């Protein structure tokens, strides 16, 4: 159910080379909360072309609630279509709540690397992002 404790979901960004804003994946429910992948181009002077791929995990952002929380561990990965041994991923641990509903990397990968038609992260101008997330939740199992 949507109350599962963990899940793995993907988000394929099409016409990637033309991405000019931040885009969100549809919601994946874990612990009855909507989790989404956020992807956007970011400016980094030292990178080749001063451009990098921003990749973040977002939780329950549309809710107006200010009384929720979810501590989660996750793996943020850009899938390598050709070799599963060559995918690039980074792990995070963060307490998600209304004031800090997203967490990730603004310089996840060089824009020139992800779009290199020879490295295996892009195909037909499409890049696929994946997140494995495990989250906890409050409950009433307590005792005197
Ligand atoms: Ca947007
Ligand atoms: Ca109880």
Author numbering: 63 to 206
Give the exact sentences the study uses for this entry.
Here we demonstrate that both p53 and MDM2 specifically recognize the N-terminal tumor necrosis factor–receptor associated factor (TRAF)–like domain of HAUSP in a mutually exclusive manner. The crystal structures of the HAUSP TRAF-like domain in complex with p53 and MDM2 peptides, determined at 2.3-Å and 1.7-Å resolutions, respectively, reveal that the MDM2 peptide recognizes the same surface groove in HAUSP as that recognized by p53 but mediates more extensive interactions. Structure-based sequence alignment of the three HAUSP-binding peptides revealed a conserved four-residue binding motif with the consensus sequence of (Ø/E)-G-(Ø/G)-S, where Ø denotes a non-polar residue.
We crystallized this domain (residues 53–206) and determined its structure at 1.65-Å resolution. As previously reported, the HAUSP TRAF-like domain adopts an eight-stranded anti-parallel β-sandwich structure, with strands β1, β5, β6, and β8 in one sheet and strands β2, β3, β4, and β7 in the other. The overall structure of the HAUSP TRAF-like domain closely resembles the TRAF-C domain of the TRAF family of proteins. The fact that most of the conserved peptide-binding residues in TRAFs are no longer present in the structure of the HAUSP TRAF-like domain indicates that the TRAF-like domain of HAUSP represents a new peptide-binding motif in the TRAF family.
